[PDB]
mmCIF file with all atom_site columns, C-alpha atoms and ligand atoms in Angstrom:
data_model
loop_
_atom_site.group_PDB
_atom_site.id
_atom_site.type_symbol
_atom_site.label_atom_id
_atom_site.label_alt_id
_atom_site.label_comp_id
_atom_site.label_asym_id
_atom_site.label_entity_id
_atom_site.label_seq_id
_atom_site.pdbx_PDB_ins_code
_atom_site.Cartn_x
_atom_site.Cartn_y
_atom_site.Cartn_z
_atom_site.occupancy
_atom_site.B_iso_or_equiv
_atom_site.pdbx_formal_charge
_atom_site.auth_seq_id
_atom_site.auth_comp_id
_atom_site.auth_asym_id
_atom_site.auth_atom_id
_atom_site.pdbx_PDB_model_num
ATOM   1   C  CA  . UNK A 1 1   ? 13.219  18.858  -3.456  1.00 0.00 ? 1   UNK A CA  1
ATOM   2   C  CA  . UNK A 1 2   ? 11.454  17.143  -0.467  1.00 0.00 ? 2   UNK A CA  1
ATOM   3   C  CA  . UNK A 1 3   ? 8.137   18.809  0.588   1.00 0.00 ? 3   UNK A CA  1
ATOM   4   C  CA  . UNK A 1 4   ? 6.450   18.082  3.963   1.00 0.00 ? 4   UNK A CA  1
ATOM   5   C  CA  . UNK A 1 5   ? 2.659   17.970  4.394   1.00 0.00 ? 5   UNK A CA  1
ATOM   6   C  CA  . UNK A 1 6   ? 0.213   17.486  7.257   1.00 0.00 ? 6   UNK A CA  1
ATOM   7   C  CA  . UNK A 1 7   ? -2.261  14.617  7.013   1.00 0.00 ? 7   UNK A CA  1
ATOM   8   C  CA  . UNK A 1 8   ? -5.929  15.597  7.161   1.00 0.00 ? 8   UNK A CA  1
ATOM   9   C  CA  . UNK A 1 9   ? -6.950  15.488  10.859  1.00 0.00 ? 9   UNK A CA  1
ATOM   10  C  CA  . UNK A 1 10  ? -9.217  12.393  10.359  1.00 0.00 ? 10  UNK A CA  1
ATOM   11  C  CA  . UNK A 1 11  ? -6.318  10.480  8.720   1.00 0.00 ? 11  UNK A CA  1
ATOM   12  C  CA  . UNK A 1 12  ? -3.875  11.342  11.520  1.00 0.00 ? 12  UNK A CA  1
ATOM   13  C  CA  . UNK A 1 13  ? -6.583  10.084  14.008  1.00 0.00 ? 13  UNK A CA  1
ATOM   14  C  CA  . UNK A 1 14  ? -6.949  6.824   11.969  1.00 0.00 ? 14  UNK A CA  1
ATOM   15  C  CA  . UNK A 1 15  ? -3.202  6.231   11.898  1.00 0.00 ? 15  UNK A CA  1
ATOM   16  C  CA  . UNK A 1 16  ? -2.971  6.797   15.675  1.00 0.00 ? 16  UNK A CA  1
ATOM   17  C  CA  . UNK A 1 17  ? -5.797  4.307   16.233  1.00 0.00 ? 17  UNK A CA  1
ATOM   18  C  CA  . UNK A 1 18  ? -4.042  1.699   14.043  1.00 0.00 ? 18  UNK A CA  1
ATOM   19  C  CA  . UNK A 1 19  ? -0.710  2.205   15.881  1.00 0.00 ? 19  UNK A CA  1
ATOM   20  C  CA  . UNK A 1 20  ? -2.160  2.347   19.449  1.00 0.00 ? 20  UNK A CA  1
ATOM   21  C  CA  . UNK A 1 21  ? -5.063  -0.170  19.518  1.00 0.00 ? 21  UNK A CA  1
ATOM   22  C  CA  . UNK A 1 22  ? -4.252  -3.607  20.905  1.00 0.00 ? 22  UNK A CA  1
ATOM   23  C  CA  . UNK A 1 23  ? -5.066  -5.928  17.989  1.00 0.00 ? 23  UNK A CA  1
ATOM   24  C  CA  . UNK A 1 24  ? -3.200  -9.213  17.408  1.00 0.00 ? 24  UNK A CA  1
ATOM   25  C  CA  . UNK A 1 25  ? -4.526  -10.041 13.890  1.00 0.00 ? 25  UNK A CA  1
ATOM   26  C  CA  . UNK A 1 26  ? -1.915  -7.820  12.141  1.00 0.00 ? 26  UNK A CA  1
ATOM   27  C  CA  . UNK A 1 27  ? -1.496  -10.150 9.092   1.00 0.00 ? 27  UNK A CA  1
ATOM   28  C  CA  . UNK A 1 28  ? -4.490  -8.552  7.310   1.00 0.00 ? 28  UNK A CA  1
ATOM   29  C  CA  . UNK A 1 29  ? -2.241  -5.636  6.192   1.00 0.00 ? 29  UNK A CA  1
ATOM   30  C  CA  . UNK A 1 30  ? -0.971  -7.825  3.303   1.00 0.00 ? 30  UNK A CA  1
ATOM   31  C  CA  . UNK A 1 31  ? -4.460  -8.603  1.950   1.00 0.00 ? 31  UNK A CA  1
ATOM   32  C  CA  . UNK A 1 32  ? -5.260  -4.871  2.013   1.00 0.00 ? 32  UNK A CA  1
ATOM   33  C  CA  . UNK A 1 33  ? -2.160  -3.891  0.038   1.00 0.00 ? 33  UNK A CA  1
ATOM   34  C  CA  . UNK A 1 34  ? -2.659  -6.733  -2.487  1.00 0.00 ? 34  UNK A CA  1
ATOM   35  C  CA  . UNK A 1 35  ? -6.291  -5.663  -2.934  1.00 0.00 ? 35  UNK A CA  1
ATOM   36  C  CA  . UNK A 1 36  ? -5.146  -2.079  -3.626  1.00 0.00 ? 36  UNK A CA  1
ATOM   37  C  CA  . UNK A 1 37  ? -2.651  -3.403  -6.211  1.00 0.00 ? 37  UNK A CA  1
ATOM   38  C  CA  . UNK A 1 38  ? -5.415  -5.535  -7.823  1.00 0.00 ? 38  UNK A CA  1
ATOM   39  C  CA  . UNK A 1 39  ? -7.727  -2.493  -8.001  1.00 0.00 ? 39  UNK A CA  1
ATOM   40  C  CA  . UNK A 1 40  ? -4.945  -0.399  -9.575  1.00 0.00 ? 40  UNK A CA  1
ATOM   41  C  CA  . UNK A 1 41  ? -4.249  -3.155  -12.182 1.00 0.00 ? 41  UNK A CA  1
ATOM   42  C  CA  . UNK A 1 42  ? -8.010  -3.416  -12.973 1.00 0.00 ? 42  UNK A CA  1
ATOM   43  C  CA  . UNK A 1 43  ? -8.024  0.388   -13.535 1.00 0.00 ? 43  UNK A CA  1
ATOM   44  C  CA  . UNK A 1 44  ? -5.155  0.542   -16.045 1.00 0.00 ? 44  UNK A CA  1
ATOM   45  C  CA  . UNK A 1 45  ? -6.428  -2.671  -17.792 1.00 0.00 ? 45  UNK A CA  1
ATOM   46  C  CA  . UNK A 1 46  ? -9.884  -1.156  -18.302 1.00 0.00 ? 46  UNK A CA  1
ATOM   47  C  CA  . UNK A 1 47  ? -8.582  2.220   -19.482 1.00 0.00 ? 47  UNK A CA  1
ATOM   48  C  CA  . UNK A 1 48  ? -6.318  0.355   -22.002 1.00 0.00 ? 48  UNK A CA  1
ATOM   49  C  CA  . UNK A 1 49  ? -9.456  -1.019  -23.745 1.00 0.00 ? 49  UNK A CA  1
ATOM   50  C  CA  . UNK A 1 50  ? -10.316 2.486   -25.049 1.00 0.00 ? 50  UNK A CA  1
ATOM   51  C  CA  . UNK A 1 51  ? -6.658  3.736   -25.275 1.00 0.00 ? 51  UNK A CA  1
ATOM   52  C  CA  . UNK A 1 52  ? -4.125  0.905   -25.888 1.00 0.00 ? 52  UNK A CA  1
ATOM   53  C  CA  . UNK A 1 53  ? -1.236  3.444   -25.741 1.00 0.00 ? 53  UNK A CA  1
ATOM   54  C  CA  . UNK A 1 54  ? -1.773  3.505   -21.935 1.00 0.00 ? 54  UNK A CA  1
ATOM   55  C  CA  . UNK A 1 55  ? 0.203   0.224   -21.880 1.00 0.00 ? 55  UNK A CA  1
ATOM   56  C  CA  . UNK A 1 56  ? 3.211   1.749   -23.766 1.00 0.00 ? 56  UNK A CA  1
ATOM   57  C  CA  . UNK A 1 57  ? 4.715   2.125   -20.239 1.00 0.00 ? 57  UNK A CA  1
ATOM   58  C  CA  . UNK A 1 58  ? 4.474   -1.681  -19.723 1.00 0.00 ? 58  UNK A CA  1
ATOM   59  C  CA  . UNK A 1 59  ? 2.129   -4.432  -20.900 1.00 0.00 ? 59  UNK A CA  1
ATOM   60  C  CA  . UNK A 1 60  ? 2.742   -6.840  -17.962 1.00 0.00 ? 60  UNK A CA  1
ATOM   61  C  CA  . UNK A 1 61  ? 0.062   -6.722  -15.214 1.00 0.00 ? 61  UNK A CA  1
ATOM   62  C  CA  . UNK A 1 62  ? 1.396   -8.318  -12.035 1.00 0.00 ? 62  UNK A CA  1
ATOM   63  C  CA  . UNK A 1 63  ? 2.124   -8.122  -8.290  1.00 0.00 ? 63  UNK A CA  1
ATOM   64  C  CA  . UNK A 1 64  ? 5.504   -9.010  -6.721  1.00 0.00 ? 64  UNK A CA  1
ATOM   65  C  CA  . UNK A 1 65  ? 6.145   -9.512  -2.972  1.00 0.00 ? 65  UNK A CA  1
ATOM   66  C  CA  . UNK A 1 66  ? 9.806   -8.888  -2.101  1.00 0.00 ? 66  UNK A CA  1
ATOM   67  C  CA  . UNK A 1 67  ? 11.250  -9.495  1.369   1.00 0.00 ? 67  UNK A CA  1
ATOM   68  C  CA  . UNK A 1 68  ? 14.710  -8.164  2.316   1.00 0.00 ? 68  UNK A CA  1
ATOM   69  C  CA  . UNK A 1 69  ? 16.012  -9.382  5.677   1.00 0.00 ? 69  UNK A CA  1
ATOM   70  C  CA  . UNK A 1 70  ? 19.171  -7.134  5.582   1.00 0.00 ? 70  UNK A CA  1
ATOM   71  C  CA  . UNK A 1 71  ? 17.056  -3.977  5.145   1.00 0.00 ? 71  UNK A CA  1
ATOM   72  C  CA  . UNK A 1 72  ? 14.121  -5.336  7.242   1.00 0.00 ? 72  UNK A CA  1
ATOM   73  C  CA  . UNK A 1 73  ? 11.675  -4.431  4.451   1.00 0.00 ? 73  UNK A CA  1
ATOM   74  C  CA  . UNK A 1 74  ? 8.737   -6.105  2.734   1.00 0.00 ? 74  UNK A CA  1
ATOM   75  C  CA  . UNK A 1 75  ? 7.920   -4.521  -0.646  1.00 0.00 ? 75  UNK A CA  1
ATOM   76  C  CA  . UNK A 1 76  ? 4.612   -4.915  -2.552  1.00 0.00 ? 76  UNK A CA  1
ATOM   77  C  CA  . UNK A 1 77  ? 5.172   -4.012  -6.241  1.00 0.00 ? 77  UNK A CA  1
ATOM   78  C  CA  . UNK A 1 78  ? 2.444   -3.680  -8.889  1.00 0.00 ? 78  UNK A CA  1
ATOM   79  C  CA  . UNK A 1 79  ? 2.275   -2.489  -12.507 1.00 0.00 ? 79  UNK A CA  1
ATOM   80  C  CA  . UNK A 1 80  ? -1.124  -0.823  -11.970 1.00 0.00 ? 80  UNK A CA  1
ATOM   81  C  CA  . UNK A 1 81  ? -2.262  2.691   -12.855 1.00 0.00 ? 81  UNK A CA  1
ATOM   82  C  CA  . UNK A 1 82  ? 0.055   4.440   -10.348 1.00 0.00 ? 82  UNK A CA  1
ATOM   83  C  CA  . UNK A 1 83  ? -0.627  7.714   -8.494  1.00 0.00 ? 83  UNK A CA  1
ATOM   84  C  CA  . UNK A 1 84  ? -0.179  11.333  -9.615  1.00 0.00 ? 84  UNK A CA  1
ATOM   85  C  CA  . UNK A 1 85  ? 1.259   14.104  -7.403  1.00 0.00 ? 85  UNK A CA  1
ATOM   86  C  CA  . UNK A 1 86  ? -2.348  15.397  -6.935  1.00 0.00 ? 86  UNK A CA  1
ATOM   87  C  CA  . UNK A 1 87  ? -3.433  11.909  -5.750  1.00 0.00 ? 87  UNK A CA  1
ATOM   88  C  CA  . UNK A 1 88  ? -0.579  11.834  -3.194  1.00 0.00 ? 88  UNK A CA  1
ATOM   89  C  CA  . UNK A 1 89  ? -0.935  15.317  -1.784  1.00 0.00 ? 89  UNK A CA  1
ATOM   90  C  CA  . UNK A 1 90  ? -4.659  16.015  -2.022  1.00 0.00 ? 90  UNK A CA  1
ATOM   91  C  CA  . UNK A 1 91  ? -7.076  13.576  -3.644  1.00 0.00 ? 91  UNK A CA  1
ATOM   92  C  CA  . UNK A 1 92  ? -6.416  10.417  -1.605  1.00 0.00 ? 92  UNK A CA  1
ATOM   93  C  CA  . UNK A 1 93  ? -6.656  12.319  1.673   1.00 0.00 ? 93  UNK A CA  1
ATOM   94  C  CA  . UNK A 1 94  ? -9.911  14.039  0.608   1.00 0.00 ? 94  UNK A CA  1
ATOM   95  C  CA  . UNK A 1 95  ? -11.669 10.915  -0.624  1.00 0.00 ? 95  UNK A CA  1
ATOM   96  C  CA  . UNK A 1 96  ? -10.672 9.008   2.558   1.00 0.00 ? 96  UNK A CA  1
ATOM   97  C  CA  . UNK A 1 97  ? -12.363 11.434  5.022   1.00 0.00 ? 97  UNK A CA  1
ATOM   98  C  CA  . UNK A 1 98  ? -15.897 9.944   4.866   1.00 0.00 ? 98  UNK A CA  1
ATOM   99  C  CA  . UNK A 1 99  ? -14.594 6.338   4.955   1.00 0.00 ? 99  UNK A CA  1
ATOM   100 C  CA  . UNK A 1 100 ? -12.275 7.140   7.895   1.00 0.00 ? 100 UNK A CA  1
ATOM   101 C  CA  . UNK A 1 101 ? -15.201 8.687   9.889   1.00 0.00 ? 101 UNK A CA  1
ATOM   102 C  CA  . UNK A 1 102 ? -17.462 5.715   9.004   1.00 0.00 ? 102 UNK A CA  1
ATOM   103 C  CA  . UNK A 1 103 ? -14.778 3.185   9.985   1.00 0.00 ? 103 UNK A CA  1
ATOM   104 C  CA  . UNK A 1 104 ? -14.051 4.851   13.370  1.00 0.00 ? 104 UNK A CA  1
ATOM   105 C  CA  . UNK A 1 105 ? -17.821 4.960   14.134  1.00 0.00 ? 105 UNK A CA  1
ATOM   106 C  CA  . UNK A 1 106 ? -18.138 1.211   13.152  1.00 0.00 ? 106 UNK A CA  1
ATOM   107 C  CA  . UNK A 1 107 ? -15.276 0.288   15.532  1.00 0.00 ? 107 UNK A CA  1
ATOM   108 C  CA  . UNK A 1 108 ? -17.125 2.098   18.406  1.00 0.00 ? 108 UNK A CA  1
ATOM   109 C  CA  . UNK A 1 109 ? -20.243 -0.036  17.597  1.00 0.00 ? 109 UNK A CA  1
ATOM   110 C  CA  . UNK A 1 110 ? -18.453 -3.426  17.523  1.00 0.00 ? 110 UNK A CA  1
ATOM   111 C  CA  . UNK A 1 111 ? -16.615 -3.723  14.183  1.00 0.00 ? 111 UNK A CA  1
ATOM   112 C  CA  . UNK A 1 112 ? -13.087 -5.039  13.992  1.00 0.00 ? 112 UNK A CA  1
ATOM   113 C  CA  . UNK A 1 113 ? -9.849  -3.512  12.477  1.00 0.00 ? 113 UNK A CA  1
ATOM   114 C  CA  . UNK A 1 114 ? -9.827  -6.356  9.862   1.00 0.00 ? 114 UNK A CA  1
ATOM   115 C  CA  . UNK A 1 115 ? -12.889 -4.654  8.230   1.00 0.00 ? 115 UNK A CA  1
ATOM   116 C  CA  . UNK A 1 116 ? -10.810 -1.537  7.313   1.00 0.00 ? 116 UNK A CA  1
ATOM   117 C  CA  . UNK A 1 117 ? -10.878 -2.309  3.554   1.00 0.00 ? 117 UNK A CA  1
ATOM   118 C  CA  . UNK A 1 118 ? -14.684 -1.989  3.445   1.00 0.00 ? 118 UNK A CA  1
ATOM   119 C  CA  . UNK A 1 119 ? -14.147 1.736   4.213   1.00 0.00 ? 119 UNK A CA  1
ATOM   120 C  CA  . UNK A 1 120 ? -11.537 2.286   1.454   1.00 0.00 ? 120 UNK A CA  1
ATOM   121 C  CA  . UNK A 1 121 ? -8.688  3.085   3.868   1.00 0.00 ? 121 UNK A CA  1
ATOM   122 C  CA  . UNK A 1 122 ? -6.954  -0.311  3.976   1.00 0.00 ? 122 UNK A CA  1
ATOM   123 C  CA  . UNK A 1 123 ? -3.590  1.191   2.912   1.00 0.00 ? 123 UNK A CA  1
ATOM   124 C  CA  . UNK A 1 124 ? -3.195  2.641   6.449   1.00 0.00 ? 124 UNK A CA  1
ATOM   125 C  CA  . UNK A 1 125 ? -3.230  -0.901  7.903   1.00 0.00 ? 125 UNK A CA  1
ATOM   126 C  CA  . UNK A 1 126 ? 0.431   -0.951  6.749   1.00 0.00 ? 126 UNK A CA  1
ATOM   127 C  CA  . UNK A 1 127 ? 1.099   0.816   10.130  1.00 0.00 ? 127 UNK A CA  1
ATOM   128 C  CA  . UNK A 1 128 ? 0.062   -2.391  11.990  1.00 0.00 ? 128 UNK A CA  1
ATOM   129 C  CA  . UNK A 1 129 ? 3.514   -3.769  11.029  1.00 0.00 ? 129 UNK A CA  1
ATOM   130 C  CA  . UNK A 1 130 ? 5.664   -0.892  9.633   1.00 0.00 ? 130 UNK A CA  1
ATOM   131 C  CA  . UNK A 1 131 ? 7.364   1.920   11.536  1.00 0.00 ? 131 UNK A CA  1
ATOM   132 C  CA  . UNK A 1 132 ? 7.818   3.771   8.188   1.00 0.00 ? 132 UNK A CA  1
ATOM   133 C  CA  . UNK A 1 133 ? 6.235   3.346   4.775   1.00 0.00 ? 133 UNK A CA  1
ATOM   134 C  CA  . UNK A 1 134 ? 7.886   4.565   1.534   1.00 0.00 ? 134 UNK A CA  1
ATOM   135 C  CA  . UNK A 1 135 ? 5.770   4.577   -1.645  1.00 0.00 ? 135 UNK A CA  1
ATOM   136 C  CA  . UNK A 1 136 ? 7.395   4.915   -5.115  1.00 0.00 ? 136 UNK A CA  1
ATOM   137 C  CA  . UNK A 1 137 ? 4.869   5.520   -7.858  1.00 0.00 ? 137 UNK A CA  1
ATOM   138 C  CA  . UNK A 1 138 ? 4.588   6.401   -11.525 1.00 0.00 ? 138 UNK A CA  1
ATOM   139 C  CA  . UNK A 1 139 ? 1.341   7.309   -13.357 1.00 0.00 ? 139 UNK A CA  1
ATOM   140 C  CA  . UNK A 1 140 ? 1.345   7.779   -17.185 1.00 0.00 ? 140 UNK A CA  1
ATOM   141 C  CA  . UNK A 1 141 ? 0.307   11.482  -16.804 1.00 0.00 ? 141 UNK A CA  1
ATOM   142 C  CA  . UNK A 1 142 ? 2.966   12.468  -14.249 1.00 0.00 ? 142 UNK A CA  1
ATOM   143 C  CA  . UNK A 1 143 ? 6.562   11.989  -13.069 1.00 0.00 ? 143 UNK A CA  1
ATOM   144 C  CA  . UNK A 1 144 ? 7.907   9.344   -10.652 1.00 0.00 ? 144 UNK A CA  1
ATOM   145 C  CA  . UNK A 1 145 ? 7.370   10.295  -6.988  1.00 0.00 ? 145 UNK A CA  1
ATOM   146 C  CA  . UNK A 1 146 ? 8.462   9.097   -3.571  1.00 0.00 ? 146 UNK A CA  1
ATOM   147 C  CA  . UNK A 1 147 ? 5.876   9.465   -0.757  1.00 0.00 ? 147 UNK A CA  1
ATOM   148 C  CA  . UNK A 1 148 ? 6.986   8.689   2.784   1.00 0.00 ? 148 UNK A CA  1
ATOM   149 C  CA  . UNK A 1 149 ? 5.637   8.709   6.354   1.00 0.00 ? 149 UNK A CA  1
ATOM   150 C  CA  . UNK A 1 150 ? 6.542   7.466   9.834   1.00 0.00 ? 150 UNK A CA  1
ATOM   151 C  CA  . UNK A 1 151 ? 3.141   8.770   11.053  1.00 0.00 ? 151 UNK A CA  1
ATOM   152 C  CA  . UNK A 1 152 ? 4.220   12.103  12.327  1.00 0.00 ? 152 UNK A CA  1
ATOM   153 C  CA  . UNK A 1 153 ? 0.841   13.611  11.561  1.00 0.00 ? 153 UNK A CA  1
ATOM   154 C  CA  . UNK A 1 154 ? 3.096   14.359  8.524   1.00 0.00 ? 154 UNK A CA  1
ATOM   155 C  CA  . UNK A 1 155 ? 4.217   12.842  5.206   1.00 0.00 ? 155 UNK A CA  1
ATOM   156 C  CA  . UNK A 1 156 ? 6.704   13.890  2.548   1.00 0.00 ? 156 UNK A CA  1
ATOM   157 C  CA  . UNK A 1 157 ? 6.589   13.921  -1.282  1.00 0.00 ? 157 UNK A CA  1
ATOM   158 C  CA  . UNK A 1 158 ? 9.558   14.417  -3.632  1.00 0.00 ? 158 UNK A CA  1
ATOM   159 C  CA  . UNK A 1 159 ? 10.287  13.667  -7.299  1.00 0.00 ? 159 UNK A CA  1
ATOM   160 C  CA  . UNK A 1 160 ? 12.136  10.332  -7.293  1.00 0.00 ? 160 UNK A CA  1
ATOM   161 C  CA  . UNK A 1 161 ? 15.613  9.893   -8.846  1.00 0.00 ? 161 UNK A CA  1
ATOM   162 C  CA  . UNK A 1 162 ? 15.800  6.113   -8.126  1.00 0.00 ? 162 UNK A CA  1
ATOM   163 C  CA  . UNK A 1 163 ? 15.369  3.109   -10.463 1.00 0.00 ? 163 UNK A CA  1
ATOM   164 C  CA  . UNK A 1 164 ? 12.733  4.193   -13.140 1.00 0.00 ? 164 UNK A CA  1
ATOM   165 C  CA  . UNK A 1 165 ? 9.520   2.099   -12.796 1.00 0.00 ? 165 UNK A CA  1
ATOM   166 C  CA  . UNK A 1 166 ? 7.743   2.476   -16.148 1.00 0.00 ? 166 UNK A CA  1
ATOM   167 C  CA  . UNK A 1 167 ? 4.281   2.518   -14.445 1.00 0.00 ? 167 UNK A CA  1
ATOM   168 C  CA  . UNK A 1 168 ? 2.849   1.358   -11.131 1.00 0.00 ? 168 UNK A CA  1
ATOM   169 C  CA  . UNK A 1 169 ? 3.474   1.429   -7.402  1.00 0.00 ? 169 UNK A CA  1
ATOM   170 C  CA  . UNK A 1 170 ? 5.982   0.029   -4.923  1.00 0.00 ? 170 UNK A CA  1
ATOM   171 C  CA  . UNK A 1 171 ? 4.889   0.067   -1.221  1.00 0.00 ? 171 UNK A CA  1
ATOM   172 C  CA  . UNK A 1 172 ? 8.056   -0.436  0.910   1.00 0.00 ? 172 UNK A CA  1
ATOM   173 C  CA  . UNK A 1 173 ? 7.251   -1.491  4.474   1.00 0.00 ? 173 UNK A CA  1
ATOM   174 C  CA  . UNK A 1 174 ? 10.090  -0.731  6.950   1.00 0.00 ? 174 UNK A CA  1
ATOM   175 C  CA  . UNK A 1 175 ? 9.036   -3.346  9.488   1.00 0.00 ? 175 UNK A CA  1
ATOM   176 C  CA  . UNK A 1 176 ? 8.898   -2.861  13.277  1.00 0.00 ? 176 UNK A CA  1
ATOM   177 C  CA  . UNK A 1 177 ? 11.570  -4.876  15.094  1.00 0.00 ? 177 UNK A CA  1
ATOM   178 C  CA  . UNK A 1 178 ? 9.032   -7.394  16.502  1.00 0.00 ? 178 UNK A CA  1
ATOM   179 C  CA  . UNK A 1 179 ? 7.273   -7.895  13.083  1.00 0.00 ? 179 UNK A CA  1
ATOM   180 C  CA  . UNK A 1 180 ? 10.062  -9.729  11.199  1.00 0.00 ? 180 UNK A CA  1
ATOM   181 C  CA  . UNK A 1 181 ? 7.867   -12.856 10.720  1.00 0.00 ? 181 UNK A CA  1
ATOM   182 C  CA  . UNK A 1 182 ? 6.557   -11.054 7.574   1.00 0.00 ? 182 UNK A CA  1
ATOM   183 C  CA  . UNK A 1 183 ? 9.985   -11.532 5.955   1.00 0.00 ? 183 UNK A CA  1
ATOM   184 C  CA  . UNK A 1 184 ? 9.721   -15.373 6.165   1.00 0.00 ? 184 UNK A CA  1
ATOM   185 C  CA  . UNK A 1 185 ? 8.766   -17.316 3.029   1.00 0.00 ? 185 UNK A CA  1
ATOM   186 C  CA  . UNK A 1 186 ? 6.470   -19.725 4.898   1.00 0.00 ? 186 UNK A CA  1
ATOM   187 C  CA  . UNK A 1 187 ? 4.613   -16.886 6.626   1.00 0.00 ? 187 UNK A CA  1
ATOM   188 C  CA  . UNK A 1 188 ? 3.996   -14.811 3.487   1.00 0.00 ? 188 UNK A CA  1
ATOM   189 C  CA  . UNK A 1 189 ? 2.892   -17.924 1.553   1.00 0.00 ? 189 UNK A CA  1
ATOM   190 C  CA  . UNK A 1 190 ? 0.439   -18.835 4.371   1.00 0.00 ? 190 UNK A CA  1
ATOM   191 C  CA  . UNK A 1 191 ? -1.092  -15.304 4.355   1.00 0.00 ? 191 UNK A CA  1
ATOM   192 C  CA  . UNK A 1 192 ? -1.413  -15.088 0.539   1.00 0.00 ? 192 UNK A CA  1
ATOM   193 C  CA  . UNK A 1 193 ? -3.135  -18.529 0.430   1.00 0.00 ? 193 UNK A CA  1
ATOM   194 C  CA  . UNK A 1 194 ? -5.529  -17.548 3.292   1.00 0.00 ? 194 UNK A CA  1
ATOM   195 C  CA  . UNK A 1 195 ? -6.599  -14.083 2.130   1.00 0.00 ? 195 UNK A CA  1
ATOM   196 C  CA  . UNK A 1 196 ? -5.517  -13.463 -1.487  1.00 0.00 ? 196 UNK A CA  1
ATOM   197 C  CA  . UNK A 1 197 ? -5.815  -16.826 -3.315  1.00 0.00 ? 197 UNK A CA  1
ATOM   198 C  CA  . UNK A 1 198 ? -8.353  -15.571 -5.934  1.00 0.00 ? 198 UNK A CA  1
ATOM   199 C  CA  . UNK A 1 199 ? -6.658  -12.312 -7.010  1.00 0.00 ? 199 UNK A CA  1
ATOM   200 C  CA  . UNK A 1 200 ? -6.804  -12.063 -10.841 1.00 0.00 ? 200 UNK A CA  1
ATOM   201 C  CA  . UNK A 1 201 ? -3.141  -11.220 -11.460 1.00 0.00 ? 201 UNK A CA  1
ATOM   202 C  CA  . UNK A 1 202 ? -0.010  -13.303 -10.936 1.00 0.00 ? 202 UNK A CA  1
ATOM   203 C  CA  . UNK A 1 203 ? 1.430   -12.816 -7.415  1.00 0.00 ? 203 UNK A CA  1
ATOM   204 C  CA  . UNK A 1 204 ? 5.149   -13.764 -7.304  1.00 0.00 ? 204 UNK A CA  1
ATOM   205 C  CA  . UNK A 1 205 ? 6.592   -14.295 -3.853  1.00 0.00 ? 205 UNK A CA  1
ATOM   206 C  CA  . UNK A 1 206 ? 10.321  -13.603 -4.161  1.00 0.00 ? 206 UNK A CA  1
ATOM   207 C  CA  . UNK A 1 207 ? 12.737  -15.430 -1.884  1.00 0.00 ? 207 UNK A CA  1
ATOM   208 C  CA  . UNK A 1 208 ? 16.241  -14.850 -0.503  1.00 0.00 ? 208 UNK A CA  1
HETATM 209 C  C1  . LIG B 2 .   ? -1.580  8.116   1.017   1.00 0.00 ? 301 LIG B C1  1
HETATM 210 C  C2  . LIG B 2 .   ? -1.981  6.864   0.284   1.00 0.00 ? 301 LIG B C2  1
HETATM 211 C  C3  . LIG B 2 .   ? -3.288  6.388   0.295   1.00 0.00 ? 301 LIG B C3  1
HETATM 212 N  N1  . LIG B 2 .   ? -3.700  5.271   -0.327  1.00 0.00 ? 301 LIG B N1  1
HETATM 213 C  C4  . LIG B 2 .   ? -2.775  4.544   -0.982  1.00 0.00 ? 301 LIG B C4  1
HETATM 214 C  C5  . LIG B 2 .   ? -3.324  3.298   -1.643  1.00 0.00 ? 301 LIG B C5  1
HETATM 215 N  N2  . LIG B 2 .   ? -3.499  3.524   -3.086  1.00 0.00 ? 301 LIG B N2  1
HETATM 216 C  C6  . LIG B 2 .   ? -4.230  4.560   -3.647  1.00 0.00 ? 301 LIG B C6  1
HETATM 217 C  C7  . LIG B 2 .   ? -4.125  4.531   -4.993  1.00 0.00 ? 301 LIG B C7  1
HETATM 218 C  C8  . LIG B 2 .   ? -3.278  3.412   -5.311  1.00 0.00 ? 301 LIG B C8  1
HETATM 219 C  C9  . LIG B 2 .   ? -2.718  2.796   -6.413  1.00 0.00 ? 301 LIG B C9  1
HETATM 220 CL CL1 . LIG B 2 .   ? -2.965  3.488   -7.981  1.00 0.00 ? 301 LIG B CL1 1
HETATM 221 N  N3  . LIG B 2 .   ? -1.977  1.703   -6.369  1.00 0.00 ? 301 LIG B N3  1
HETATM 222 C  C10 . LIG B 2 .   ? -1.749  1.173   -5.135  1.00 0.00 ? 301 LIG B C10 1
HETATM 223 N  N4  . LIG B 2 .   ? -1.092  0.001   -5.080  1.00 0.00 ? 301 LIG B N4  1
HETATM 224 N  N5  . LIG B 2 .   ? -2.176  1.698   -3.961  1.00 0.00 ? 301 LIG B N5  1
HETATM 225 C  C11 . LIG B 2 .   ? -2.929  2.805   -4.106  1.00 0.00 ? 301 LIG B C11 1
HETATM 226 C  C12 . LIG B 2 .   ? -1.424  4.896   -1.079  1.00 0.00 ? 301 LIG B C12 1
HETATM 227 C  C13 . LIG B 2 .   ? -0.404  4.014   -1.766  1.00 0.00 ? 301 LIG B C13 1
HETATM 228 C  C14 . LIG B 2 .   ? -1.073  6.075   -0.428  1.00 0.00 ? 301 LIG B C14 1
HETATM 229 CL CL2 . LIG B 2 .   ? 0.576   6.624   -0.485  1.00 0.00 ? 301 LIG B CL2 1
#
């Protein structure tokens, strides 16, 4: 059921840089994940203009932010296009190679980790705050999958038997012990207002 894969060498190098570099401005991970959700919602919305049946798996286009203090997780949920098995295992890693190389060269010349999204690899900024990331996803053309990685240089993919999603992506951040501020209502609200106030989809910050 669970298959294990090696990241492309450039992606393992990027993840190590994100985990090892001293960089205090960790809060930017949330803007990067919300921007990915917004891009995924724009993609399904635009495809639905030529094929309305693409919304048979759910008409609502939104982003939810769900903290869970008991589990020490922050989850970013969207009803965007979702990812196929081929996206998870091959396509996302392949497309990211040029952007990863460009980003690592830009950092050597004076750029900052907060610019990661300009290189299309902002998802990996999740490792600024998470020791493990679990991604549940469902694309209209494929089955529901669970992707997972604690940065071994490896990740896993399995068909998911959990709560059916309809369509979209859930990024579950298993936070590092010293990063629990990202479970606080006031802190998430502050970050969303600072970096994500103009996103074109409703962002609901759940509370406990
Ligand atoms: C390996 C990897 C790379 N990039 C990403 C970021 N991404 C790529 C496609 C995609 C969609 Cl359709 N929705 C969301 N919200 N995020 C997405 C992930 C989620 C993984 Cl798992």
